[PDB]
Amino acid sequence: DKYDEASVLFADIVGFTERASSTAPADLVRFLDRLYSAFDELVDQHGLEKIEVSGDSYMVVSGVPRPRPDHTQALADFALDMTNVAAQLKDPRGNPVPLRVGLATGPVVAGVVGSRRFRYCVWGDAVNVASRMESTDSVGQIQVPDEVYERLKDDFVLRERGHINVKGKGVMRTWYLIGRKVAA
Question: Which GO terms describe its cellular component?
Fold first, then answer.
């Protein structure tokens, strides 16, 4: 188990049988599941692996066993394909893209609990603050914090958002949104 520092990504769609659908066993909850089935296949690129998942939530940490200096930049470009890929599939059945993505970085510790329960999990200060970014997101874009905003090395475009309302942190902080990666 290690402590150090790592970046974490959190993702979840609000358009998962909650809008105005009647709920059907056929076609429904199968085309959306086919989208997420394309994300795990596209995983093979860098040091990334799926950790925790209760229901329809999807979160990936960069704190994999083998850590790289550019762990913050590994998810920064990965979040650009999260929206790009989930945009080609439209026909048949017209569905919008209300996908909400939230980023965060900081101290991350490995779980791995012996006996009593078969699980590896992931916990830390960063993992806790990566969820609130998702739950409280407008339009349907990626929400980046100040921490990740400091790790860009003049290679990423970020736009200021502002402040909202929080209960966990208490004091609100300036948030940003990643548009595209700077490539000369």
Answer: plasma membrane
- Distance of alpha carbon 85 from the chain centroid: 14
Q: What is 104-149 written as a DSSP string?
A: EEE-EEE----SSS----EEEHHHHHTTHHHHS-STT-EEB-HHHH
Residue 4 assigned as binding residue: no
**Residue 150 host element (H or E):** helix 146-150
Q: How was this structure determined?
A: X-ray
Judge whether 137 is annotated as a binding position: no
The CATH number given to whatever domain includes residue 13 is 3.30.70.1230
Q: How far apart are CA 135 and CA 127, in angstroms?
A: 14
Number of domains comprising the chain: 1
* Structure-block tokens of residue 100: 């909400």
CB 84 within 8 A of CB 60: no
